């Protein structure tokens, strides 16, 4: 199976051919990425830009929701927390 002309030998030959094909693919992509690529850099830059954009929009939406909740501080009445015939607590922001 190691040397002689046989079916195992042919199977080994085909396996070696497949691995050599994939070695060639590795070489192709290595040389391409090392000398023939700007797309990676451009895309990385664009993705960093996208991150900045994402975080901006996030913070903005959070601020708007916070303003919506701040509109309820006018409705908030800390005297209603008072129990009848008891004093008001400074815990509820007199």
């Amino acid at each position: 199976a190691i040397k002689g002309p046989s079916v195992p030998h042919s199977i080994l030959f085909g396996v070696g051919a497949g691995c050599c094909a994939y070695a060639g693919y590795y070489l192709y992509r290595a040389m391409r990425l090392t000398f023939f690529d700007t797309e990676s850099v451009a895309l990385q830059s664009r993705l960093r830009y996208a991150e900045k954009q994402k975080l901006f929009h996030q913070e903005l939406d959070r601020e708007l929701a916070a303003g919506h909740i701040a509109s309820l501080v006018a409705e908030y009445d800390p005297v209603a927390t008072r129990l009848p015939f008891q004093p008001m607590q400074d815990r509820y922001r007199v």
Partner: protein, 104 residues
Amino acid sequence: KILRDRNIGLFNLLQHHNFAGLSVNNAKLSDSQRVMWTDLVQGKPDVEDKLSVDAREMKVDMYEKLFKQAADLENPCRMPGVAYLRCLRDTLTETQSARRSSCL
């Protein structure tokens, strides 16, 4: 009963989201945020001469961001506050003594 329950729920919600109002009754605040808010509520917002002009710009931007998140367009004090901070932006490269006459 309904009003008590509603208002306790509001208080717990505001405590949960870490809100601070005109009555500064929040312990989880940063000391810097507390100073800034107490200046906007009780004292006078002003940039110090110790600071560099870039840091003065940053301080005024912080004031404007905080105040615009706090006061909405329906609020009456929004226009005066924004006007005062705009005057500070106009008069960054000045001393407090010269800035008072213009922003008073």
